């Protein structure tokens, strides 16, 4: 996608969490694995 698209994320509990691609973290081709739970509001047992 491009840098200015919007995201409709759907979790395992089937919840609509809105976001924009400005927000996820970007880095080089290396050991990159930022945290999932920090940006959206999610429960303990749910995955996008």
Instruction: Determine the interface stretch with DNA among 1-9, 15-23, 24-32 (rule: CB under 7 A).
Output: 24-32
Closest to DNA by CB, 14 vs 28, is 28
SS3 7: strand
Nearest distance from residue 43's CB to DNA, in Å?
13
**Measured from the CB of residue 36, what is the shortest distance to DNA in angstroms?**
11
For residue 34 the two structure tokens come to 């930022």
Euclidean distance between CA atoms 8 and 12, whole angstroms: 13
**14 makes contact with DNA (CB under 7 A):** no
How far, rounded to the nearest angstrom, does the alpha carbon of residue 19 sit from its chain's CA centroid? 7
């Amino acid at each position: 996608n491009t840098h200015d698209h919007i995201l409709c994320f759907s979790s395992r509990g089937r919840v609509y969490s809105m976001k924009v691609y400005q927000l996820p973290e970007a880095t080089r081709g290396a050991r990159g694995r930022p945290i999932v739970n920090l940006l959206p509001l999610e429960q303990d047992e749910r995955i996008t």
